[PDB]
Structures are given as C-alpha cells and as structure tokens.
Enzyme design. Sequence first.
Site, short mmCIF file in Angstrom:
data_model
loop_
_atom_site.label_atom_id
_atom_site.label_comp_id
_atom_site.label_asym_id
_atom_site.label_seq_id
_atom_site.Cartn_x
_atom_site.Cartn_y
_atom_site.Cartn_z
N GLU A 1 47.15 88.17 50.37
CA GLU A 1 48.49 87.76 50.78
C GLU A 1 48.51 87.42 52.29
O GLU A 1 49.32 86.64 52.77
CB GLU A 1 49.48 88.89 50.46
N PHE B 1 48.07 83.69 54.16
CA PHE B 1 48.17 82.86 52.97
C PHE B 1 49.64 82.55 52.72
O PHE B 1 50.41 83.38 52.22
CB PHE B 1 47.55 83.58 51.79
N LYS C 1 18.01 77.49 53.21
CA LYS C 1 18.79 78.72 53.43
C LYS C 1 20.03 78.32 54.19
O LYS C 1 19.93 77.84 55.33
CB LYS C 1 17.95 79.73 54.20
N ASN D 1 27.39 82.74 60.26
CA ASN D 1 27.19 83.94 61.09
C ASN D 1 28.38 84.53 61.84
O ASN D 1 28.15 85.34 62.75
CB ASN D 1 25.98 83.76 62.03
N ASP E 1 28.66 86.81 46.59
CA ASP E 1 29.72 86.72 45.60
C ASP E 1 29.35 85.66 44.57
O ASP E 1 28.50 84.81 44.78
CB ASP E 1 31.10 86.48 46.26
N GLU F 1 -3.80 95.76 54.66
CA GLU F 1 -2.44 95.31 54.38
C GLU F 1 -2.44 93.86 53.90
O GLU F 1 -1.71 93.56 52.98
CB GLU F 1 -1.47 95.57 55.56
O1 GLA Z 1 19.91 83.35 63.35
C1 GLA Z 1 19.12 83.46 62.16
C2 GLA Z 1 19.46 84.72 61.36
O2 GLA Z 1 20.86 84.60 61.01
C3 GLA Z 1 21.39 85.61 60.11
O3 GLA Z 1 21.28 86.87 60.79
C4 GLA Z 1 20.50 85.64 58.87
O4 GLA Z 1 21.04 86.56 57.91
C5 GLA Z 1 19.03 85.92 59.20
O5 GLA Z 1 18.22 86.07 58.06
C6 GLA Z 1 18.55 84.81 60.15
O6 GLA Z 1 18.56 83.62 59.33
NA NA Z 2 31.85 87.83 43.15
NA NA Z 3 30.45 89.42 50.03
NA NA Z 4 51.34 85.41 52.18
#
Ligand code: GLA
Ligand code: NA
Ligand code: NA
Ligand code: NA
Lengths: 719, 719
Positions: free
Chosen positions: B276, B279, B475, B479, B525, B605
């Site tokens: 709400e 909005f 990706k 941010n 989501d 490793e």
């Molecule tokens: O600035 C780059 C940085 O931005 C966010 O924090 C993302 O979740 C990271 O994985 C990386 O991609």
């Molecule tokens: Na969801």
């Molecule tokens: Na979320």
């Molecule tokens: Na509202």
Amino acid sequence: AIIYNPNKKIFTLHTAHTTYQMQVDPLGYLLHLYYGEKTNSSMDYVLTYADRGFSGNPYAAGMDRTYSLDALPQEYPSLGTGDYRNIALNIKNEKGVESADLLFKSYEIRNGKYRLQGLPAVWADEKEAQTLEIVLADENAQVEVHLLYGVLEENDVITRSVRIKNTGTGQITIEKAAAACLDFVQGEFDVLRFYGKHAMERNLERTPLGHGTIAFGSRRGTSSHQYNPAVILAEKGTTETAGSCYGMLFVYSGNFSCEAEKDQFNQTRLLLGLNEELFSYPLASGETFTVPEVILSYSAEGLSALSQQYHNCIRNHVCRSKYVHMQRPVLINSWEAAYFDFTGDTIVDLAKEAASLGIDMVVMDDGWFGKRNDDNSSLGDWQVNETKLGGSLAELITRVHEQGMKFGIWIEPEMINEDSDLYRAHPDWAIRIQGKKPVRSRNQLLLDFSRKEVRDCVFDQICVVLDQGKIDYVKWDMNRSMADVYAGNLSYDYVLGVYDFMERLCSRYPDLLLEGCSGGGGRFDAGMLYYSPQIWCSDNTDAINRTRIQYGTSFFYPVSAMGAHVSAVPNHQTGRVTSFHTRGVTAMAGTFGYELNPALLSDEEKQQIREQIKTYKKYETLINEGTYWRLSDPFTDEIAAWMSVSEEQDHALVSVVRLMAEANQATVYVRLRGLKPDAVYLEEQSGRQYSGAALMHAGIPLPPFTEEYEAYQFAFTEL
Amino acid sequence: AIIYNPNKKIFTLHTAHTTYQMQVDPLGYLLHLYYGEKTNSSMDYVLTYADRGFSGNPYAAGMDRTYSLDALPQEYPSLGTGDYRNIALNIKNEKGVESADLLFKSYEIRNGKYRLQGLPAVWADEKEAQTLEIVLADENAQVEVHLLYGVLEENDVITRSVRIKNTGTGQITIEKAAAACLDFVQGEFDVLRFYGKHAMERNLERTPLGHGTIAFGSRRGTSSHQYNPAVILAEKGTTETAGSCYGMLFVYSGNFSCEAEKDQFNQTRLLLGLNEELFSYPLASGETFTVPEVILSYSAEGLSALSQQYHNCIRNHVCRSKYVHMQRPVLINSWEAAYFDFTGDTIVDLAKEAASLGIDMVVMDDGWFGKRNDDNSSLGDWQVNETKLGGSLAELITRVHEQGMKFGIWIEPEMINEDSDLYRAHPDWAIRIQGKKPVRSRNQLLLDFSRKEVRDCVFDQICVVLDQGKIDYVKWDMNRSMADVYAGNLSYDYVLGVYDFMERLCSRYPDLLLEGCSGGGGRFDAGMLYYSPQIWCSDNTDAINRTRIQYGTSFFYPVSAMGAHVSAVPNHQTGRVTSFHTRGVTAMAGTFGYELNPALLSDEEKQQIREQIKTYKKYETLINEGTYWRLSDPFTDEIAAWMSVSEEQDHALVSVVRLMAEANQATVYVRLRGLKPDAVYLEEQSGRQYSGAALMHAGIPLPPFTEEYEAYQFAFTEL
Ligand SMILES: OC[C@H]1O[C@H](O)[C@H](O)[C@@H](O)[C@H]1O
Ligand code: NA
Ligand code: NA
Ligand code: NA
Ligand SMILES: OC[C@H]1O[C@H](O)[C@H](O)[C@@H](O)[C@H]1O
Ligand code: NA
Ligand code: NA
Ligand code: NA
Ligand code: NA
Ligand code: NA
Ligand code: NA
Ligand code: NA
Ligand code: NA
Ligand code: NA
Ligand code: NA
Ligand code: NA
Ligand code: NA
Ligand code: NA
Ligand code: NA
Ligand code: NA
Ligand code: NA
Ligand code: NA
Ligand code: NA
Ligand code: NA
Ligand code: NA
Ligand code: NA
Ligand code: NA
Ligand code: NA
Ligand code: NA
Ligand code: NA
Ligand code: NA
Ligand code: NA
Ligand code: NA
Ligand code: NA
Ligand code: NA
Ligand code: NA
Ligand code: NA
Ligand code: NA
Ligand code: NA
Ligand code: NA
Ligand code: NA
Ligand code: NA
Ligand code: NA
Ligand code: NA
Ligand code: NA
Ligand code: NA
Ligand code: NA
Ligand code: NA
Ligand code: NA
Ligand code: NA
Ligand code: NA
Ligand code: NA
Ligand code: NA
Ligand code: NA
Ligand code: NA
Ligand code: NA
C-alpha cells in the site's frame, strides 16, 4: 513373527507394522538394536564404539577400551556390568554382593503366548502369538534370567516378562527387577505420565526429557491414584495423529517404578517394572521368581493409534470376562444415594424407582455387613446385618428380583477395622510391625493377604454371602495404602494373595460381573482388568472433572473399562452444579449407570433418565467396541470432545462438553477423526450429510451455548 | 477441475489432492468457504451468523444484524464493506472517496492458464490447467474487479491474480491491491517468514500468530533481502513431515506487503500482494490495472511436501529457460577472485587455470566497462574498457574460447553513477525529486526504468556489447534500493520497465543463461525466475552461513535456482576458515561453480576441484531434478543436512555439514526421508546395503569428526 539369525546372533520380532531387534554380541551380552517401523534389515550397523572417558570395559573386552556397557544399548541392563545408568536388575547374592553380569546361554521360540505363575498376563492363541524365551546367566551371582517376549502381530504389541532363578546353594535376594528396558542410541523425547490424587486421577503430564531422570512409582502396595503404571515416550513433536511414540504398560496392581533417563551421550533409557523400594525378595536354592508383565507398543502415526492398540489388546487379550462381548446391565449404586443411611426397604425402594426408569440392576454398596453404620467398624465381619436389612440377604435379593431388577453387592475383603469381631479374635492378622503402633487410614488396617489362613477365612465368609442368592455383580473395593511393611517379600506376596483370592472368586462365580475399585481408580491397571472388565474410574463424579480423568485414562485403557455414573448435584466432591444432560453425556463415556436417589428428581429429570438409558443402549456396542478418538485436550481447549467409530467406519458417535464460557461467543468447531474421507455421512438429528474429509478437516460447528457446561452428542451414519 | 453449482452459487477448484471452495451469497458477496484436503462436499455449512456487537450490516441485509462482512470469510475483502480487518482492496474514486464494496456480476471457466500483461506468471497448457475468472463490481466506486484463479491439478497449485478496471468517466487511484486472501473461520497457526539482510538472506522466523497482525513487506522497489515475498501459515504443531500448512508466494520482483491477522472472533486472515505504501496508481476511464500473481498451495502432510509442490511448479511452470532441462556449464566468476583489479590477460589466465581443472566457463564480473576501476563511477557507460582489457571484447572472447572455455559477463542496466558520461548528458534520467538532493547507495542512483527512452538507451548499449561475440551467460545485477520516489505510479511502472527490458533481452538472446542478481539474493523471487533459471543466492559465500541461507531459500525455491560458488578462505565476508571439501559440499546444493583464483591454491586443492566437478556433473540431474528434503534445522541442530531423491526413488544423494564440535563426541545420526520403505539401497563408497525403512527411522551414523565443520556426501542406489 520371531526370527533368529544364528550367524549374526540377531533375534527379530515382527508385528504387522513394527520390528523389534536384539543381538547377542561376541562377549555374550544381549544388546538392543532397534524398535520402530517394520524393517527386514539387520540393524546392527547402528551400534558404534569409541573410547569414552570413564566408560569402562568388561575384563573379556581385553585391551579394547571402546567396548562398554556404560554406553551400549541393552535388553536388560544390570548392576554389575560397569554400566552406571539406571538399571533393570540388581541381585544380592548368597555372600552379600550386589552384582549381576548376564551373558547369553540359550533361547527358544514357541508358538502361542506365555503365561505367568500366579499373575495376570496377556493371553492369545498359538496362531495369534509367538513367544521368545532367552536364557542369560551369571555364574558368580549364580542367577539365571529368563527374558520372555510375547509377539501379538495383529495388535502391534510386544510383551515382556522375566523369570529369575537361583542356581546356587545359598539364598539370594532380588533387590530390583524391571520387566522392560528400551535403550535408544538417539532421539529427543517427551515423557507422558498420568498423575493425580484420590478423586482426581490420571491427569496428563507431558514434559521434555532433559538430562537426568524423570521417575515415578508407587510403594503404596497398589498401582495407585498418584501415578499410574504407564508411560509414553513420544518423540519431540509427536501429536495425536502423527509421529513416533512408544508405550509401556505394567500388567500389575502392586508397587512399581518407571525411570526415563537422558544420558551423557544423549541416549535414552526407559525402564518399567517393580519398585526397588520395600523389595528385597528372598529366593532359595533352585527357586524361581516371576516379574509381572509389561505391554509395549509403538506407533509411527501419533498417540491416538498407540492408544487404540492398547484398547484392542486389553479388551481382546487381557480382560477374560464374558461381558467384553455382551450387554452390561445399567446399574444404580446406593453409595452417593444413601451412604450408610439405608435399610432393606430403602434398597427395595431404590429398585422400584430404578425399574420404572429402565435401569437393570441395583447395587447395595458399603454398609450392609457387621454393624457398618459408618466407616469406623466391621471390615472383616462379612456377616449380613439383618437388623438393618429388615430380614435376610436372600429375602432382600428376592424382593429386588420381584421388581424386575438384578442385584449387586460391595465387598472390601483385604481390610480390617480394629472395631470388628475379626480383629478382636485375630489382631495379628493385620499387617503391622511387632511392637509398633500402625498407621491407620480411613480408620482401618490391611489384612495380611500374604497368609493363606487369613485369605481363606475371608474367602469363606464372602462365599457364604454370595451363595445366599443370585448376585449378578460384585464391586470389590480397597480403601487404603499399605504401611507398616514388615519384610522385603511382603509387597509382592500380598499381591500374589490378592490375585489368588480374585482368581478363586472368579472361578467359583464365573457369571459374575466384577467391578474393581480402590477409592475410585486407585488400582486402575491391566492387572485388575484381567479379572474385572470395568473399574470404578474415580470417586469424583463431577462431570467436568470426569472429562479430564476419562481423557487421561483413555491413553492406555478402553472406554469399556471406565466405571462412570450419573450422580446428583451440587456434586458431592466439588460442590459444582452441572446439567443432567451434561452428566449423562459424560457418564456414557464408560459403563454408564446412576448413583443417586431418583425419588428426589423432577419428572423432567426422570424422563431424561429414560431417554439416556435408551441412548446408551442404542450406542452401547459402538461405545464399547468402537475405535476411540480424543478430539480435544480438556487441559487447554474450549471443549472436551471424543468419539467412537465402528470397525467398518460406517457409524460414529461424537460427544462434546463445553468447558469455557464468555459473551459474544466465537463459533467452536469439533473436528472429527477416524472416518473414511470419501464416504458420505448422515448426521442423525439434523438430517444433514457430509463427506468424511469435510468432517475431519473443517469439522462441524457447535450450536451456540445458552448456559454453562453444555454438552452435545452427534451420531453419524454412512450413506 | 473447476465446477460451478448455479443453485448454491458455489465455485469449487479441485487439484489432485486439495479443494478450494467459494460461494456468492444472496447479497452478491463472494465468500470463502474452504481450502484444504480434497472433498466433494458443499462446505457452505461452515458459515455461521450471530449478532456480534459493532459488526455492522450491509444496507441490503435489512434488519438482519447477524450478517456482517466484519465477520464473514471472503475471497477479496475491501475497504468500504463495513469490514474492519486488514483488507485486500482500497480504491479512491473520481470524487476522493476511499470505498469499494464488490458484488458478483459474472464468471467464466476456461481451459488453460491465464497470462498477465507485462508480468511474469505461472504458465501451463490447456490440458494441465484451467482458469476461473470472476467479475465483481461496485457501481458507486465505478470499478470492476476481475479475480483470476488458475488451477494446476497435478501440482496441487492454485494461482490468484486480479485485474481492476475503471468503468467511470473520472480518474481513480488504486491505493491497495492484494493478489490473494485466505480467510479461516477456525484454527491456531504459526507464521513462517524469511527475513534477513544483505549477505544473510532468508533466515527462517516461525512464531505463533497471536491476536493482532504479523506483517512484513518491502518498499525498496525490490522484493528485497530483508523479507522475501513468501509466507507459510502452518497449523500449530505442523512439522516437516506432518500437518496442515498453506503457502503464498508472490510472483513479483517489486514492492509487496504480507499481513496475517488473528481477529476478535479467533478467525485468521492472510493477505499477500502489492504494498500500500508508495502505491497510488492512477487509472483513467476505461483502463485496467493488473495485480501480480500469487501461487497458493496446501499440504496436509507437512512443510516438506509444500516446498516440493513449489519446487515443481517453479521449475516446470515458471522458469522458461532451456537450462531447466539441460546441463549448465560449471563457471568461475572473477569477482571475489579479482574484484576490479584485472586485465584481459588476467581473465585469459583465469580461463587457462579453470580449463585445466574441468571448469566450463569464465564470467567476467564487474569492472570491464567505462572507467570502472572501483564502484564509484561508470554505471550507464556500457562501453568496453579496451585499455583495461588490452584489446577488444571480441578478441577477449576469442582468446577465452581458444582455451576451450565459454564466456559470461556482468551487467547492471538499471543504474547510473554521477561520475559517468551518461549522467553528465542526462542527469534527469535518474530517479529523483525535483529540487531535492537524492539518497546515494553504493555511490549510485537508479535510472528511471518507467521511461521508455531511458530503457532504450541502455538496451541498445547492452546489445552492442552482447553482439561482439558468443556470450553464453549474463549476470544481471542491481545494487541498491529505490529512494526519492516521486509519484504513486513509479514503483509499479519501474518494475514493468525492468520486465520489459528483461523480456526483450531474453527474446533477442534466447540461448543465453541469465543469472539474476541483486547484491546476492535481493530479488530472489519467482518473478525473476520466469526469466533467469538461477539467481545468485547471496554475496555471503561462507559455507557455514550458506547452510542457513540455502535452507531458508529451499522453503519455496528449488535447489536448481540457487547460485552457489566455492570461494576462498579466510572467507571475504566473515573471516571464517572452512575446508575446501566443506565449501564443495555446500556449493553443490545449487548451481555450483567457483569464485576464486585457482592459481593461489595448492595442488591438493586443485585436485579437489577436479574431483568436485566430476561429482557435481555425476549428480547434476539428481540435484537439479530430484525431490528435495531438509533433514535438519541448521538454526537448532548439530548438522545441516539435506538430500535429493530421484522421481522413481531409486537414487539419492545425502549431504551433511557439521555445525557444532565438542570433545568425547556423541554419535550423530542422519535420518533420511523420501525413500521406498521396503526397497533395499546400496551406499556407494562403503558398499553397505540398507532398507528404506531403516534409513528413514534409524538413519545412518556419521563418521566421527576430527576437525571442525566437516562435511559428508553419501550416495544411495536401489538394488
Ligand atoms: O560489483 C559486483 C558485485 O555486485 C554485487 O555485490 C554482486 O552480488 C556480486 O556478486 C558482484 O557481482
Ligand atoms: Na517469489
Ligand atoms: Na527477494
Ligand atoms: Na496506497
Ligand atoms: O465406602 C464405600 C465407598 O468406598 C470407596 O470410596 C469407593 O470408591 C466408593 O464408590 C464407595 O464404594
Ligand atoms: Na558404544
Ligand atoms: Na565402566
Ligand atoms: Na568402570
Ligand atoms: Na552413559
Ligand atoms: Na544405549
Ligand atoms: Na541386556
Ligand atoms: Na548393564
Ligand atoms: Na530393593
Ligand atoms: Na532395550
Ligand atoms: Na477417586
Ligand atoms: Na494417576
Ligand atoms: Na530429566
Ligand atoms: Na509411593
Ligand atoms: Na504412586
Ligand atoms: Na492412576
Ligand atoms: Na545426562
Ligand atoms: Na536419546
Ligand atoms: Na523401573
Ligand atoms: Na493406594
Ligand atoms: Na505380586
Ligand atoms: Na481396581
Ligand atoms: Na481402582
Ligand atoms: Na492405578
Ligand atoms: Na496397567
Ligand atoms: Na457420550
Ligand atoms: Na462420568
Ligand atoms: Na478428548
Ligand atoms: Na458471521
Ligand atoms: Na460493520
Ligand atoms: Na459499522
Ligand atoms: Na473481525
Ligand atoms: Na472470516
Ligand atoms: Na470477497
Ligand atoms: Na470486506
Ligand atoms: Na479467502
Ligand atoms: Na547478499
Ligand atoms: Na529474506
Ligand atoms: Na499478531
Ligand atoms: Na521496506
Ligand atoms: Na523488505
Ligand atoms: Na529475500
Ligand atoms: Na484479535
Ligand atoms: Na483462526
Ligand atoms: Na497484503
Ligand atoms: Na533492495
Ligand atoms: Na510492476
Ligand atoms: Na535476482
Ligand atoms: Na537476487
Ligand atoms: Na552436496
Ligand atoms: Na554455497
Ligand atoms: Na536442512
């Protein structure tokens, strides 16, 4: 089924839906592997071994510090193995040494179900049951221990008992003997126990099992009002309808101890059996002692299924009475109606009143014998008071039969008053310590039922009374706890004496309906139910309190076993008033019956009696034989609600008593259980139809209340 | 199935195992009757009516004081009916009046699953789904409301959405619009929600619902790190494996509100939909607004089944990517490996390193564009920094392909830094309030994605970059949260702009693997999952914290969606050290991948990487497609444990991470779930065999630990 794998030395017990598994290890110890959901696996992989500080090792383990009976799960742990947990067995040998360190000797698998010398026990036929007997021994203690496991497949029941034999030349004493031990290597659990007092028995207490022991028991000479000899170990989160849970029920009417302990390694040990207190039982060379039986069961599906397994086992494999499968006469009892203030004419008037209402039987309760005009004399003087009765017992019985009524009578054969002819003749027959004035309770003493001559005297008197006429019913009561315990065999031998008398009585009078009693439910146990198919559940006949008592009693015991009567108000124990209808609904969750003088009632309440009896008789088979479901918790909820469902799930009776009242009431729904989801059910009085699924998920709304403590019954029939 | 009973005016929605039922009452209100276990009954009997003080009556109820929308259960309650509870809809009409009082007009049942204008939504075919559209209206508000119900039988899913139309001449504003309302006339419930912060998302909070409201939401312009747009209403006592529970999941990546309220009559109302706050959405004459979708589901069998229903729905009816049913390349990401300190040569070195280990793809993360040598410039300047890369992007891509590696790239198209060419040219393209200096977060601002010209500029720049070579993976990050919100349409229209850009991108580049990101899981989501089959689950790559984040994320979202990488230690977010093996086990509960410079690792490793990749690829189908089970709660238990089981229950992979360490350790068992009880399973590495029943009841003992935070994987195959 019972299987032995000789190579792994594993014994597996299967019921229809559960598996119990044990193993003889390379040192001869009998370890517990598993009890739970059915499996064909070898569960020996669950055992683990580590060097655990201060958990020491049998000499026979040599240099292997990882092998300790202070850590490993065991069928029958004992004092003398290096195990420091609560233990099942303690023997003090012919030299004074408390030690038993038991190693496997032999076994046998037999068809059928073992019986126990001088004791009640689960029974079954050779097709329904198998028995495993494992023999263990300690050559230094010179004891031989026979572990008995009874497997009743269809019932999902495993029974356990123990026979202990002295194989040496000198006397030993048994200082502790449990019947059953469950050792869990893992799990978080709650302990459910059933506590109370006189006139308020078997309240549910459920708590988490923290580190340490939760314990309870009786040294009263009786199973007791205070703690019933029953325990449920529920996995954390288990509800009425889901989750793992384990029961142990002691088939015994004397002293007991239950111990549940969560240990240093987060393991759980559950023990049930005889009390260690006032128990130092002498066993001569070559003699055997029998520990009373425990009935174990497991449910993966919650507490309600567990209880149903016990109800079925008790009705069909413990109770021996024909009345398990027959109509039981609806009775009226003289006690709250008249107490000691009655005559023969009073009793006949009660019969006439009760006959006009559809009651089947009159029970003449305490006050008919000796000069018993109060509770301060005459126990032990089981001669009819013909002055009070206005004639003989034979004549009274006939006068009652002439009103169309059956006749019942109360007895209390284990007891004696100082003011009695018996005590003036035989004061040494009372349990007492020489030179010490005894505890008195209800101004009476216990007779020493460990002595044959004492039992025979009283048995003969009781036979003379019962032989005077057709007595359909006996209420056998017992109104105080044992004190002045003079030796370490007495608690156990007293109870053997009680059961001997009770067996003799039932054998001589095989058509008798025997109702057990001990100030209400003071010996409400499966040991008694072997003889009496019903037990007076409580002296509290307040309908509201009875919802709690009956709820608690239902965790192990079938409805059919619970003596329950409609009584007068204001209630004689609480002073509370309840409607006649609510008293009726509540008392129909049991034997039903009446305990009041109907002559004092209004015509409307007399008509309610007529209709109540018609209702009870209509639903008697369903209530007594049907599957029982708790639908609410009367400690926390708005209502006390329960139901009985036929085997075929085609008929159900739902009962509800409201417990709380406020203005502007919210709508309360009762959610049903145990129906067929896709079946359609007709509710009788209303004529509305519902699916099982609807009735179990949404339930039905209760009609709004207009008065306090209202009650309801709803009947459903599958279309 | 969807059924209409015209005589009772009841609409019934059936899935395979659940029923949802509603009814149009005699006044035209759309009441909610039932949602739960499947039933063919008419559940209208659950409605009750009383004169409840201060719960008033529609004028149309006349003198009937027992009829109140302040009491009755409703499909879509609104402000303006006399209901005083939290409500689903508030319309402020052309005259300034906040009122909506909705009455039934019409309906249609259609085969197939509705779609939503400009928004992600569950999809299915005409055989798999049906749709119910109910039209309600208020002639005074001049609004028409279309309630959409989507029924996916096999999945036990019911979806809900809403379309709101202005049927008058003047403008209205939508002030609140939920997508779904569940009204319970009865029940005690807990509310499960998933809360957190940047780098620690989706912690489980489970509390009882007391009187009043439990609420949570986002006005960040995003679904958020702080509260995920998801809720479980669990009946009291419900566990992972038993009891009733209800889910609502918002298929939306913007603002939301969830409200659960226990009312004055002990009823429960659960709402999920748009916030709400911020909005106030204008709707001109004849225009329609679409509320984003909620996915509802019900389980009678506990939380694990509920989650599985969501996992199936999301994988098979939300995610559109081909990579749901294909191997996904194992990637290495440059971000924790290099941050901003890289060159083209660095990137090729990372490709060479990763190729020698069996990694499939290198992702060049932030730092490649503009003069982005830190996070203080260049967002909006999506031109390749050829100085830093030592040449063109096309050449870099080819050099990486020459190492046998695929190529991925990071973008953040919604954002702008003041220090950028774009901002120097178009400062008005940032979201801001005229005359007010804006909030800065990571020293950047949001672009106004509600504006086509802004989106087109950036879209064109991104296309130029992606057209330089074969880019296998993008990706798409975001941010910061939205601030300086300048009008009541912006939050919603911004997100429409994001989805438009995202749809355009996916349509132009249909073979791209798109990973969503927002500082980790800040927009984790189902709205995003419609476009991107995986989302970077968290910037926290600490294995121990990831056990909690991944646990929480699993309540609604499939493992396959959870971006998870093995990173270096000491961990860059927590400073904690964990073994390489534990990082591997934890990161295999998701997409897998690496985010470190392997050149710094020991040879041992590096060999672990080789073996990890072989393990992940061997189990990839099982992990991504198998039925998921939480086997412990990492908030309370000794271990974090989970497993994936094949559809046929013939294969399982069990993963365990220990969380606690003490001396003289107790034996810890992992109990499995989801197997066939009677089947026999071979554990691979050990070669031991067990029944499903054994594995589910007793489990398996974990090998004793010798170091902290040890992890295990066990593979089981049906014999
Ligand atoms: O600035 C780059 C940085 O931005 C966010 O924090 C993302 O979740 C990271 O994985 C990386 O991609
Ligand atoms: Na969801
Ligand atoms: Na979320
Ligand atoms: Na509202
Ligand atoms: O004294 C008689 C009295 O004794 C006990 O209290 C019983 O439980 C009662 O029902 C009644 O028989
Ligand atoms: Na051990
Ligand atoms: Na020891
Ligand atoms: Na020791
Ligand atoms: Na111990
Ligand atoms: Na043990
Ligand atoms: Na043992
Ligand atoms: Na022992
Ligand atoms: Na003793
Ligand atoms: Na045991
Ligand atoms: Na009592
Ligand atoms: Na008790
Ligand atoms: Na304890
Ligand atoms: Na006691
Ligand atoms: Na006791
Ligand atoms: Na008791
Ligand atoms: Na302990
Ligand atoms: Na335990
Ligand atoms: Na004990
Ligand atoms: Na007693
Ligand atoms: Na005895
Ligand atoms: Na008794
Ligand atoms: Na009793
Ligand atoms: Na008892
Ligand atoms: Na008992
Ligand atoms: Na009843
Ligand atoms: Na009663
Ligand atoms: Na109940
Ligand atoms: Na109402
Ligand atoms: Na109102
Ligand atoms: Na009003
Ligand atoms: Na209300
Ligand atoms: Na409601
Ligand atoms: Na509605
Ligand atoms: Na409303
Ligand atoms: Na609703
Ligand atoms: Na994060
Ligand atoms: Na969160
Ligand atoms: Na609240
Ligand atoms: Na917010
Ligand atoms: Na938030
Ligand atoms: Na979140
Ligand atoms: Na309230
Ligand atoms: Na409720
Ligand atoms: Na809401
Ligand atoms: Na945000
Ligand atoms: Na939007
Ligand atoms: Na995302
Ligand atoms: Na995200
Ligand atoms: Na794993
Ligand atoms: Na991870
Ligand atoms: Na888990």
